């Protein structure tokens with residue numbers, strides 16, 4: 001079973017301090033015990049504990065394989081942060097479980113404006129990677145202005161913008177715009193939604209306006225639903 | 241406009257204490273101010289604050305309407321409870337947002353045998369109902385034997401059993417079996433998954449074996465994903 005993260009495994013047999021502590025102290029494993037490792041960059045490694053020190057754990061690598069990513073294309077969720085950090089952190093973990101390549105926390109007219117710490121979110125993604133047995137974790141970006149996302153998202157991507165609130169004066173669904181074979185980015189707004197002016201700018205740049213369904217979702221739940229829309233479409237649209 | 245919960249609104253013009261406190265003491269609203277209530281049984285009510293006391297908030301009701309549920313058919317998630325109840329609290333909140341009619345916590349061979357904090361789950365369901373502007377919250381069942389779910393779920397209903405693990409494993413996807421117009425129940429197992437014989441029994445009864453995707457999901461995530469599969473399928477066919 002369990003997978004450990006060792007980003008420097010290709011150049012070093014010393015495991016990171018945190019993984020070492022867990023493996024030796026918490027799990028009480030010993031020299032000769034086998035381990036699965038990932039570098040976080042698409043590979044799994046078979047390893048055996050060589051040496052256990054008071055502080056550190058050293059392994060030998062016996063073999064290696066490339067992970068086959070269990071979805072197609074690149075999926076980016078670009079989304080407003082939640083007021084409560086627990087909610088966006090719970091969401092991040094779920095997105096990693098489901099399958100995501102990039103999560104961008106944005107700034108928009110009606111969004112929360114506090115600086116978001118990238119490192120804690122990275123650690124949460126790494127944790128969900130190991131838990132769900134994946135060999136990669138998404139790119140995380142924080143405090144990115146909405147207009148940067150609109151202007152600079154690679155235009156070969158299907159770029160969807162989700163909005164709900166009645167005041168924002170037609171939509172369609174992700175199934176109307178998403179094609180397997182292309183990258184996809186979904187932009188999801190704050191509790192107060194995107195402004196009309198933000199939407200026009202999105203559409204001018206080639207974004208397609210979408211609904212995620214008929215229920216009124218919290219921000220973090222809309223991130224999850226949007227990502228699952230993509231996975232669902234990749235499955236229920238397989239030909240054969 | 242925020243929505244408040246007043247289950248007794250048809251018999252009483254006194255608001256429940258937690259809502260009264262929030263409205264007067266936290267939100268600072270006063271008599272003459274308009275409110276939206278639900279009884280949690282499918283109706284919204286238009287109301288006005290009439291009187292505030294040192295202890296109570298009294299309203300008058302000036303309109304009532306039946307809620308239009310934002311999905312079709314009935315959706316049931318029948319799931320093994322996680323060791324930690326916090327995971328199940330998060331899941332239920334999101335299921336209520338997304339849209340579900342019934343959530344059934346099961347007992348199966350490998351499932352966690354524990355009391356479910358059912359009062360807590362109702363409270364979460366009620367909060368999610370109010371946040372997402374719904375007028376009802378799902379039926380929540382606890383400690384239901386898996387064999388009861390297998391045997392007694394109506395045959396008219398699309399019945400899916402999700403399983404993933406190697407020893408147990410052809411599966412389709414929920415889209416190979418569900419089409420709009422029919423009720424749906426999805427059976428989701430514990431960490432150890434359903435045993436072979438549970439699968440066999442379910443399959444004997446007419447359940448369809450499904451995969452939810454290629455990713456390894458925690459129990460709580462699989463609940464959400466299965467529910468969303470249904471909503472997605474419904475949207476595609478509007």
Ligand SMILES: Nc1ncnc2c1ncn2[C@@H]1O[C@H](CO)[C@@H](O)[C@H]1O
Nearest residue numbers: 162163188189193211212213217222
């Ligand atoms: N049903 C929905 N359809 C489209 N977008 C949605 C839906 N529910 C939530 N959202 C998104 O979540 C954000 C916060 O509610 C909104 O700005 C919007 O981007």
Ligand SMILES: Nc1ncnc2c1ncn2[C@@H]1O[C@H](CO)[C@@H](O)[C@H]1O
Nearest residue numbers: 402403404428429433451452453462
């Ligand atoms: N890919 C999947 N396909 C089917 N069921 C799944 C999948 N991932 C998780 N589950 C469900 O979640 C439970 C816990 O893994 C399983 O018993 C199963 O019911």
